[PDB]
């Protein structure tokens, strides 16, 4: 017997942690990891919202949300592939031109 | 409900374009030819413009619970289609000099047209998400088209991480609203407790990235410098034109947008967008960063109309005409930038210091950039002035004195950089589809002049479309 | 002489027991230990969804199919943490190519299983075992059955024959750096894998618990034994297919076959 | 039910903390897989029967396999260790931690204002999403297939192979 | 039940592991080309719509088969596109 | 209980390191008695052929790789000792650098000798030290009264 608020604050905590991981690190792999974490947090919030009302509203966009996660992770990983293929340095400060 | 022939005639824009992707993909796998793919893609988008007449034969109606088709959506589909038509005609001259795989370009632009014409028709929060992402994936990938440069890949990666981040904010906000309300349909929403308002603020974050608002505008310089100029034509015009329609419809239908709690927050964003655009825009000596800076201010003027949508019915046509004028101005300006890069040339060397002269080099093309650049500002005899005039009238109508004052002082600040580029094309000097590209920008120059001096026929179209 | 076929495996298991375990230097330790059980426990818990008896059902859960697909997808991680724990670019690339062909040939089983679960219309295995009451779901879906056969024999069942060796030079099979009990763990894992794939095939495609003239549990056991013998016969008959030919007859040929299979079942079911 | 939800939520939280504290990538991939398994356990506990098993087959069985491939092929273990730990000090971890904590406490204060109206673990079968997917939501499926084609073509393009 | 079998399995895993303890930089052209597996990552998501479809098809009927044929036709067009451009070919 | 000893007698894994010559008879034996043998998995290494000075480190790395319980069968006169090649390029026996348990003379030995090597090696594995005070009995001494009692043999002008 758990109401919606506990699950929603859990999803908010995972959202915040994914955002923090997106902010603080330097490696683009780690920003993509935090991006996927925070996508999963949003998907969890959607699923608990969908199962709160007791109808089939949680599985209808979660599939498409994880479809977006798959496509975004794939294109991002291919961009990392071609970036490391271009330059051996994997820091974001290598690609930090056009400042200001 | 099921599928009726009324629904298929209503859906005809989303259908012709989808059939075009299939035929273009089959044609790519058959021959891998640039001429055939360009012809096949432009024919499908022109067929979508023709079929806009047929959906005009159909009335204001629903297809599914996801979408609602009105005459408002008819005009927004048209804006997106001419931008897609505009970007393919500007891409052929740029891509003729590209070394290989010159055929994936039209496939991605066609996907982005599907995404744009899906955010025109919106009635449920999920269609809002199927549209934002359908257009981003070509804009994920087309700013990274020609990744052989050191900055296109840079621009693609910065836009990729940030756009996925905005979509994650939009999706988390989209659910936190649906926790209170029993349905995510725009109309059914709001049937002022803090969770619904808190969920609403998260959607503002996820929407204001793509609309280039004040604390989310950081991407708009960099990718506009990095992306190819054919991509910048689509990225400046079509994406935000299509996106602005769905964010306006959410506040028109949803009763929560009637409350002043969201209204004050959006007004402050609009206030700061004008100011934080038009002050940092002065110092730039690059034309692509210059247009990217102006984009932030133009979307701010759209917001100062949108905040007074709920006070007076003139805001509907005001937003519509400023979008039409804003389309024509940016297409002409960005077409001239792309038309200077008639070969691929590797990295195009475009700057405000690189545009000394340009009247004794190419006089007609300098005239188009000047006419459009004066149209961006608010100078009369141009369609931008009539659009500026309605947003001033809407702000006067709704007694938003700080906001209308911001537009005037923002116009006063922003006159400066538009005028330098207009006079810098008059200092001392330091193929067939190219003629077609010149025809597109020259056609737009004639249109913005005749609809600035004589603006009534465009208003008749807009009041014809508005419900 | 030994009269039982299993006694050889019994002696082998005893042999793998009580063997000193050596630590690898300059290697990760958690994945060196964890890669075997990702291959073992997956097909061990794949056995948890069989309706061996209505009264002795191992698990009366509502969904068993999704659990099977979740184990099928999970299995790749065992070959991947084994590849990274090999700590030898040769062996690592060998495990990378093995996981490549694995992910390549694991695609088909879900789409082949859609036909039987669509004509069954439920995920609870009681509904499937009650569906095959008079007509089994093998007569119409010949193509789906053979596609599921190829997919089931393609998941690290040695039919590809690229596990302990590599047709391509510069790389090596990934079963070399494990030599303690973990190698016996690999063998017992593929053994529970083959028997669980056979049991799932008999209880999901053919009709389990029929009992024409004899009690139905031994009817299921004997039919499973016949399919075991046929699987071993075709596995032995099946020669080693080189990497190229496997890539050629993969996504090209059987994705359309299963798509027209879904079209046929959707057209005939209504 | 209550104890199962609490223990799997805490398992997910611990896995999320673990994946954001370590340096070696493979530990992070393993802990993120563990977190996803915990989320699927949450999905099964809530009653979303077509969600807990749908996440693993795809989200933790295909996309994470792509992550494993790219982190395996880069071979970034054994190189570039010291400077990342040098830069990632606790002092720079506190900086944005409180900035995200403001967001956390704001959303916690936002969610505690509503009533509970607790819902039991109602089971939703696939029979009804087979209708809801096919009710208003057919064009969502079609345009999602087009979305997936778009992802396929942009991933094939920008990951272009060459002689090198 | 399932919980009892899971407890038994994890207890057996603990028993075997405890018993075992007591008993006592640059790749250049090599590797790369995992993009077949990325094609799988995307195609599993495509087939997940069929995973949800397969449960309820009798009430779907003729439009369901129609738009499923459209879906798999789009997938087939994409597959033949990837084949004909040379993306899906021999791979290391 | 000694069940472990039965386990080790019942099943053994052979690592075939036969060299240029002398391995054709070993193959003759292996294709009758038995791709299963794998490096770092076997506990029995049948050293055959002439152990050359150049390749001896290969045999020392393969000896190091296998686990703690190591058994080695030397086959042929060229591997037990230097054999006929008492030359700068041949080491005088494989027992110089690795311990050896069973020695199988011949040049090349026969497959039946390999069979009797497995029989004597399971017999040794079933008495456990390793000597166990039972291996002093020798084939020189066990069948001595068998061999001495032989009187007549077929004349060698016949087939
Ligand atoms: S023992 Fe005889 S057959 Fe074997 S290597 Fe020596 S000489 Fe050759």
Backbone conformation region of residue F48, classed left if phi is above 0, alpha if psi is from -120 to 50, else beta: beta
Task: State how far the Cα of F116 lies from the Cα of C259, in Å rounded to an integer.
Answer: 60
State which residue of chain B sits closest to D152, comparing Cα positions: B137
- In 10 A of CB C166, how many CB atoms? 20
Q: In B148-286, where does DSSP find H-type helix?
A: 152-178, 194-208, 219-226, 229-253, 260-278
- The answer for residues whose C-beta is within 8 angstroms of residue C46's C-beta and 6 or more apart is C67, C68, C71, C192, C193, C196, C197, C200
Q: At B164, give phi and psi (nearest 5°).
A: -65, -35
Q: Which subunits sit against D, judged by 3+ Cβ pairs under 8 A?
A: A, B, C, E
**3-state SS record for chain F:** CCHHHHHHHHCCCEEECCCCCCHHHHHHHHHHHCCCCCCCCCCEEEECCCCECCCHHHHHHHHHHCCCCCEEEEECHHHHCCCCCCCCCECCCHHHCCCCCEEECCCCCCHHHHHHHHHHHHHHHCCCCCCCCCCCCCHHHHCHHHHHCCCCCCCCCCC
Residue F154 resides in a domain: no
- Shortest CB distance from C104 goes to which of E23, E40, E68? E40
Contacts of D54 in chain C (CB under 8 A): 66
Q: How many domains does the structure of chain B reveal?
A: 1
- Shortest CB distance from B172 goes to which of A4, A41, A53? A41
- Shortest CB distance from D140 goes to which of B66, B147, B156? B66
In Å, what resolution does this model reach?
Answer: 3.8
Q: Which of F20, F73, F107, F110 to mutate to test the pocket of ligand 1 (most atoms within 8 A of CB)?
A: F107
Task: State how far the Cα of F80 lies from the Cα of E47, in Å rounded to an integer.
Answer: 64
- The answer for residues whose C-beta is within 8 angstroms of residue D103's C-beta and 6 or more apart is A12, A16, A19
Residue F155 resides in a domain: no
Query: C-alpha distances in angstroms, A35 versus A16, A18, A31, E62?
Result: 11, 6, 6, 40
Task: State how far the Cα of C53 lies from the Cα of C136, in Å rounded to an integer.
Answer: 18
Question: Residues for chain B: how many in total?
Answer: 467
How many contacts (CB atoms, under 8 Å) link C and D?
A: 63
- In 10 A of CB C83, how many CB atoms? 25
Element (H, E) at D130: helix D126-132
Give the strand pairing for B61-62 and B68-69. antiparallel
Closest CA to C48 of D50, E2, D54: E2
State which residue of chain C sits closest to F2, comparing Cα positions: C14
Q: Are B110 and B21 in contact (CB under 8 A)?
A: yes
CB contact under 8 A, A45 and B147: no
- Does D107 contact chain A (CB < 8 Å)? yes
Say whether the C–A interface has 3 or more Cβ pairs within 8 Å: no
- Structure token digits, residue B83: 């931008």
Q: Are F109 and F27 in contact (CB under 8 A)?
A: no
Q: Which subunits sit against F, judged by 3+ Cβ pairs under 8 A?
A: C
Q: Which of D154, D160, D162, D163 to mutate to test the interface with B (most CBs of B within 10 A)?
A: D154
Q: Which of F26, F29, F78, F89 to mutate to test the pocket of ligand 1 (most atoms within 8 A of CB)?
A: F78
Three-state SS for B438?
helix
Q: Please check if F21 is assigned to a binding site.
A: yes
Calculate how close chain E gets to A74, using CA atoms only, in Å: 6
- Exposure string of B319-354, with b = 16+ CB inside 10 Å and e = fewer, is bbbbbbbbbbbbbbbbbbbbbbbeebeeebebebeb
Task: State how far the Cα of B68 lies from the Cα of C216, in Å rounded to an integer.
Answer: 58
Element (H, E) at B68: strand B68-69
Q: Are F83 and F50 in contact (CB under 8 A)?
A: yes
Q: What is the largest CA-CA distance in chain E?
A: 65
- The answer for residues whose C-beta is within 8 angstroms of residue D76's C-beta and 6 or more apart is A90, D25
Separation of CA F34 and ligand 1 centre (Å): 23
Task: State how far the Cα of C99 lies from the Cα of C80, in Å rounded to an integer.
Answer: 7
| DSSP letter, residue D59 | I
CB contact under 8 A, F67 and C180: yes
- The answer for residues whose C-beta is within 8 angstroms of residue D157's C-beta and 6 or more apart is B101, B104, B141, B145
Closest CA to B69 of B136, B139, B135, B15: B15
B306, HSE (Cβ side, Cα atoms, 13 Å)? 30
Q: Are C57 and C130 in contact (CB under 8 A)?
A: no
- The answer for residues whose C-beta is within 8 angstroms of residue F114's C-beta and 6 or more apart is F26, F29, F33, F46, F75, F104
Q: Are B211 and B235 in contact (CB under 8 A)?
A: no
Q: At F73, give phi and psi (nearest 5°).
A: -110, 120
The domain in which residue E13 lies consists of 1-91
Residue with CA nearest ligand 1 atom 2: F107
- Exposure string of E16-25, with b = 16+ CB inside 10 Å and e = fewer, is beeebeeeee
The domain in which residue B52 lies consists of 1-467
Task: State how far the Cα of C51 lies from the Cα of C56, in Å rounded to an integer.
Answer: 8
- In 10 A of CB C126, how many CB atoms? 14
Contacts of D125 in chain C (CB under 8 A): 62, 123
CATH value at residue F38: 3.40.50.12280
Strand order in the sheet with F44-47: F14-16, F44-47, F71-75, F102-104
Q: Are C156 and C39 in contact (CB under 8 A)?
A: yes
CATH value at residue E45: 1.20.58.1610
Task: State how far the Cα of C10 lies from the Cα of E42, in Å rounded to an integer.
Answer: 43
- Structure token digits, residue C195: 């028997």
- In sequence order, what are the beta bridge partners of D48? D124
**3-state SS record for chain C:** CCCCCHHHHHHHHHHHCCCCCCCCCCCCCHHHHHHHHHHHHHHHHHHHHCCCCCCCCCCCCCCCHHHHHHHHHHCHHHHHHHHHHHCCHHHHHHHHHHHHHHHHHCCHHHHHHHHHHHHHCCCCHHHHHHHCCCCCCCCCCHHHHHHHHHHHHHCCCCCCCCCCCCCCCCCCCCCCCCCCHHHHHHHHHHHHHHHHHHHHHHHHCCCCCCCCCCCHHHHHHHHHHHHHHHHHHHHHHCCCCCHHHHHHCCHHHHHHHHHHHHHHHHHHHC
CB contact under 8 A, C80 and D54: no
Cis preceding linkage at F108, omega within 30: yes
CB contact under 8 A, A76 and B222: no
Contacts of C81 in chain D (CB under 8 A): 26
Identify the residue whose tokens are 């075009």. B20
Contacts of A49 in chain B (CB under 8 A): 175-176, 178-179
- Structure token digits, residue C155: 């998941």
Q: Are B169 and B205 in contact (CB under 8 A)?
A: yes
- In D, residues 77-96, which contact C (CB 8 Å cutoff)? none
- In 10 A of CB B442, how many CB atoms? 17
Q: At F6, give phi and psi (nearest 5°).
A: -60, -35
Q: Are C229 and C149 in contact (CB under 8 A)?
A: no
Element (H, E) at B69: strand B68-69
Q: Which subunits sit against C, judged by 3+ Cβ pairs under 8 A?
A: D, E, F
Q: How many domains does the structure of chain F reveal?
A: 1
Query: C-alpha distances in angstroms, B327 versus B434, B446, C48, C90?
Result: 21, 14, 61, 57
Query: C-alpha distances in angstroms, D12 versus A7, D7, D41?
Result: 12, 9, 9
Task: State how far the Cα of C149 lies from the Cα of F52, in Å rounded to an integer.
Answer: 50
Identify the residue whose tokens are 């999403």. D129
Q: At B185, give phi and psi (nearest 5°).
A: -60, 140
Task: State how far the Cα of B349 lies from the Cα of F68, in Å rounded to an integer.
Answer: 70
Contacts of A46 in chain B (CB under 8 A): 171-172, 174-175, 178
Backbone conformation region of residue D47, classed left if phi is above 0, alpha if psi is from -120 to 50, else beta: left
Query: C-alpha distances in angstroms, A73 versus A68, A94, B269, D12?
Result: 8, 22, 31, 21
Residue with CA nearest ligand 1 atom 6: F78
| DSSP letter, residue D56 | I
Task: State how far the Cα of A69 lies from the Cα of B137, in Å rounded to an integer.
Answer: 12
CB contact under 8 A, B3 and E63: yes
Closest CA to C63 of D33, D59, D60, D126: D126
Q: How many domains does the structure of chain E reveal?
A: 1
Task: State how far the Cα of B186 lies from the Cα of F70, in Å rounded to an integer.
Answer: 76
Element (H, E) at B61: strand B61-62
Identify the residue whose tokens are 């490391």. A84
Element (H, E) at B62: strand B61-62
CB contact under 8 A, D127 and E25: no
Compute the radius of gyration of chain D from its Cα atoms: 21
Task: List ligand 1's pocket residues with C-beta within 6 A.
Answer: F 21-22, 49-50, 76-78, 83, 107-108
- The answer for residues whose C-beta is within 8 angstroms of residue B101's C-beta and 6 or more apart is D157, D160
């Amino acid at each position: 017997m758990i109401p919606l608020q506990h699950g929603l604050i859990l999803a908010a905590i995972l959202f915040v942690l994914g955002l923090t991981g997106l902010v603080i690190r330097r490696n683009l792999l780690f920003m993509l990891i935090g991006l996927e974490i925070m996508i999963n947090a949003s998907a969890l919030a959607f699923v608990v919202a969908g199962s709160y009302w007791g109808q089939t509203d949680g599985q209808v966009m979660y599939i498409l949300a994880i479809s977006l996660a798959a496509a975004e992770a794939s294109i991002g990983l291919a961009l990392l592939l071609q970036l490391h293929r271009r330059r051996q340095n994997l820091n974001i400060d290598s690609v930090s031109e056009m400042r200001g | 409900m099921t599928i009726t022939p009324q629904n298929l005639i209503a859906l005809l824009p989303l259908l012709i374009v989808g059939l075009t992707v299939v035929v273009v993909m089959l044609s790519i796998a058959w021959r891998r030819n640039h001429f055939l793919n360009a012809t096949l893609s432009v024919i499908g988008l022109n067929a979508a413009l023709v079929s806009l007449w047929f959906v005009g034969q159909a009335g204001a109606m629903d297809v599914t619970p996801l979408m609602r088709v009105d005459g408002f959506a008819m005009l927004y589909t048209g804006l997106v289609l001419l931008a897609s038509l505009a970007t393919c005609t500007f891409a052929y001259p740029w891509l003729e000099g590209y070394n290989d795989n010159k055929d994936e370009f039209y496939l991605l632009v066609l996907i982005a047209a599907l995404g744009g014409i899906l955010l025109a028709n919106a009635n449920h929060l999920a269609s809002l998400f199927l549209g934002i992402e359908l257009i981003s994936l070509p804009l994920f990938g087309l700013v990274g088209y020609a990744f052989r440069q050191k900055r296109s890949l840079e621009a693609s990666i910065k836009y990729t991480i940030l756009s996925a981040a905005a979509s994650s904010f939009l999706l988390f906000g989209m659910a936190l609203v649906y926790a209170q309300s029993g349905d995510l349909s725009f109309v059914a929403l709001g049937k002022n407790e803090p969770l619904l308002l808190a969920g609403f603020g998260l959607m503002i974050v996820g929407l204001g990235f793509k609309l280039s608002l004040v604390p989310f505008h950081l991407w708009t310089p960099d990718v506009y410098q990095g992306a190819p100029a054919p991509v910048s034509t689509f990225l400046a015009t079509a994406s935000k034109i299509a996106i602005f329609g769905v964010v306006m419809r959410l506040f028109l239908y949803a009763p929560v947008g009637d409350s002043e709690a969201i209204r004050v927050v959006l007004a402050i964003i609009a206030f700061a967008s004008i100011i934080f655009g038009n002050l940092m825009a002065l110092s730039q000596t690059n034309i692509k960063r210059l247009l990217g800076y102006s984009s932030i201010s133009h979307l701010g003027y759209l917001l100062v109309a949108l905040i007074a949508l709920q006070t007076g019915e003139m805001s509907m046509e005001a937003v519509g005409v400023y979008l039409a004028g804003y389309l024509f101005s940016s297409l002409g300006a960005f077409g001239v930038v792309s038309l200077m890069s008639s070969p691929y040339r590797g990295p195009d060397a475009d700057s405000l210091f690189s545009y000394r002269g340009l009247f004794w080099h190419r006089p007609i093309l300098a005239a188009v950039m000047t006419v459009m650049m004066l149209s961006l500002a608010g100078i009369p005899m141009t369609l931008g002035f009539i659009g500026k005039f309605y947003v001033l009238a809407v702000g006067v109508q709704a007694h938003l004195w700080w906001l209308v004052g911001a537009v005037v002082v923002g116009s006063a600040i922003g006159l400066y950089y538009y005028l330098r580029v207009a006079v810098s094309l008059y200092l001392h000097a330091p193929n067939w589809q190219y003629s077609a590209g010149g025809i597109v920008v020259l056609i737009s120059a004639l249109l913005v002049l005749v609809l600035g001096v004589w603006p009534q026929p465009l208003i008749s179209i807009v009041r014809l479309a508005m419900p | 002489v030994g009269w039982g076929g299993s006694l050889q495996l019994v002696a082998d298991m005893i042999k793998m027991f009580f063997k000193e375990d050596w630590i690898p230097k300059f290697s990760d330790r958690v994945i060196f230990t964890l890669a075997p059980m990702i291959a073992f426990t997956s097909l061990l818990l794949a056995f948890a969804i069989v309706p061996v008896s209505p009264g002795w059902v191992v698990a009366d859960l509502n969904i068993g199919i999704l659990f099977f697909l979740m184990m099928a997808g999970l299995a790749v991680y065992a070959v991947l943490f084994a590849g990274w724990s090999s700590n030898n670019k040769y062996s690592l690339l060998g495990a990378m190519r093995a996981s490549a062909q694995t992910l390549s040939y694991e695609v088909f089983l879900g789409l082949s299983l859609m036909g039987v679960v669509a004509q069954a219309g439920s995920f609870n295995m009681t509904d499937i075992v009650n569906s095959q009451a008079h007509v089994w779901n093998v007569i119409p879906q010949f193509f789906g059955f053979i596609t599921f056969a190829i997919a089931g024999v393609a998941v690290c069942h040695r039919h590809p024959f690229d596990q302990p060796e590599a047709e391509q030079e510069l790389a090596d099979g990934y079963h070399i750096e494990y030599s303690g009990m973990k190698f016996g763990l690999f063998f017992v894992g593929e053994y529970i894998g083959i028997v669980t794939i056979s049991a799932l095939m008999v209880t999901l495609f053919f009709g389990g618990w029929q009992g024409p003239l004899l009690p139905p549990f031994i009817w299921f056991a004997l039919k499973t034994a016949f399919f075991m013998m046929m699987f071993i016969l075709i596995r032995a008959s099946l020669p080693r297919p080189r990497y190229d030919q496997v890539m050629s007859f993969g996504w090209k040929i059987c994705l359309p076959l299963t798509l027209i299979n879904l079209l046929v079942t959707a057209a005939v079911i209504l | 039910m209550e104890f199962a939800f609490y223990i799997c939520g805490l398992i997910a939280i611990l896995a999320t903390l673990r994946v954001i504290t370590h340096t070696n990538p493979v530990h992070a991939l393993l802990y993120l897989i563990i977190s996803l398994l915990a989320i699927s356990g949450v999905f099964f506990s809530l009653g979303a029967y077509f969600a807990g098993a749908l996440e693993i087959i795809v989200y933790a069985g295909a996309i994470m396999v792509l992550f494993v491939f790219v982190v395996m092929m880069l071979n970034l273990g054994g190189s570039e260790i010291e400077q990342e730990r040098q830069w990632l000090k606790p002092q720079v971890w506190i900086g944005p931690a409180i900035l995200s904590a403001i967001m956390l406490v704001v959303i916690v204060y936002a969610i505690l204002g509503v009533n509970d109206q607790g819902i039991d673990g109602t089971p939703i079968s696939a029979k009804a999403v087979g209708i809801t997917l096919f009710g208003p939501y057919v064009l969502a499926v079609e345009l999602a297939s087009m979305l997936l084609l778009a992802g396929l073509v942009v991933a094939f393009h920008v990951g272009r192979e060459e002689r090198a | 039940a399932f919980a009892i079998f899971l407890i038994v399995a994890i207890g057996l895993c603990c028993l075997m592991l405890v018993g075992g303890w007591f008993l006592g930089a640059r790749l250049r052209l090599s590797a790369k080309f995992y993009l077949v597996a990325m094609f799988f990552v995307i195609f599993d998501v495509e087939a997940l719509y069929l995973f949800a479809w397969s449960t309820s098809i009798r009430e779907s009927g003729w439009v369901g088969f129609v738009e499923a044929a459209i879906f798999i036709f789009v997938l087939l067009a994409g597959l033949v596109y990837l084949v004909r451009i040379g993306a899906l070919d021999w791979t290391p | 209980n000694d069940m472990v000893n039965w386990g080790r007698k019942n099943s053994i894994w052979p690592y075939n390191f036969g060299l240029s010559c002398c391995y054709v008879e070993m193959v003759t034996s292996f294709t009758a008695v038995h791709l299963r043998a794998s490096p770092r998995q076997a506990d029995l290494m049948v050293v055959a052929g002439t152990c050359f000075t150049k390749m001896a480190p290969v045999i020392q790395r393969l000896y190091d790789q296998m686990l703690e319980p190591k058994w080695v069968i030397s086959m042929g006169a060229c591997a037990n000792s230097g054999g006929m090649y008492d030359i700068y390029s041949v080491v005088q026996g494989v027992d110089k650098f690795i311990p050896v348990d069973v020695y199988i003379p011949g040049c090349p030995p026969r497959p039946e000798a390999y069979m009797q090597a497995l029989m004597l090696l399971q017999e040794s594995i079933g008495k456990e030290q390793g000597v166990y005070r039972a291996n002093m009995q020798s084939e020189r001494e066990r069948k001595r009264g068998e061999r001495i009692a032989v009187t007549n043999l077929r004349t060698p002008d016949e087939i």
